[PDB]
Ligand binder design. Structure first.
Ligand SMILES: CCc1cc(-n2c(=O)[nH]c3ccccc32)c(O)cc1O
Length: 208
């Protein structure tokens, strides 16, 4: 059973802007996803200080970067707090409507696409490099779900019976054909060192 939803008009406009605007500095998508993972890991870390049982679904707090040249995918996995089905549907836990408004007003006032994360909609920068994005998530208070969108104004949500995660979020980027550099080990290492060198959680870059 797959449910299909329409993006609110402001998010469909944001996604169209990210896909159609000429902007060469696409590598910032990785910083934005690692930053979101770090925020999720901070939240489960803080919650676990008063309720240690919230770590029964996994004590390790980390981020994995998994390239797959055969599938042309780059996957970002974290063991953060995860998202409920309600959070996924409500713009993946972001203030996307007001955030898109503030980002649009900033772009007219001198800001560029790399500042997207300051408006809480950094997730959508995944569409700088991906034709399709799959978000697999498991929160302690809900079941495992898969969100998916190739943009075009709609997204889907389904239960995920594939590999149980325990807790956290998995972002699968189905890369555009001219964006395969983001599957190269030396290129990922370079971007992590440039933009995410001081993240408070281990970042493991998987090899093939
Ligand atoms: C949709 C953006 C995104 C969101 C999350 N995320 C969650 O899954 N829970 C979060 C709680 C606070 C902040 C971000 C969170 C993540 O772990 C990775 C991501 O790329």
């Amino acid at each position: 059973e797959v449910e299909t939803f329409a993006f609110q008009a402001e998010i469909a406009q944001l996604m169209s802007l990210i896909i159609n605007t000429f902007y060469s500095n696409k590598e910032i998508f990785l910083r934005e996803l690692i930053s979101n993972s770090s925020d999720a890991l901070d939240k489960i870390r803080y919650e676990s200080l008063t309720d240690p049982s919230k770590l029964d679904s996994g004590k390790e707090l980390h981020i994995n970067l998994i390239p797959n040249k055969q599938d042309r995918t780059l996957t970002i996995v974290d063991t953060g707090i995860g998202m409920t089905k309600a959070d996924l549907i409500n713009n993946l836990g972001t203030i996307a409507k007001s955030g898109t408004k503030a980002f649009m007003e900033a772009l007219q006032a001198g800001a560029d696409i790399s500042m997207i994360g300051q408006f809480g909609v950094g997730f959508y920068s995944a569409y700088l490099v991906a034709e399709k994005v799959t978000v697999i998530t498991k929160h302690n208070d809900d079941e495992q779900y898969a969100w998916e969108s190739s943009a075009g104004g709609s997204f889907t949500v389904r239960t995920d019976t594939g590999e149980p995660m325990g807790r956290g979020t998995k972002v699968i980027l189905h890369l555009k054909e001219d964006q395969t550099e983001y599957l190269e080990e030396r290129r990922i290492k370079e971007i992590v060192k440039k933009h995410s060198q001081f993240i408070g959680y281990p970042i493991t870059l998987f090899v093939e």
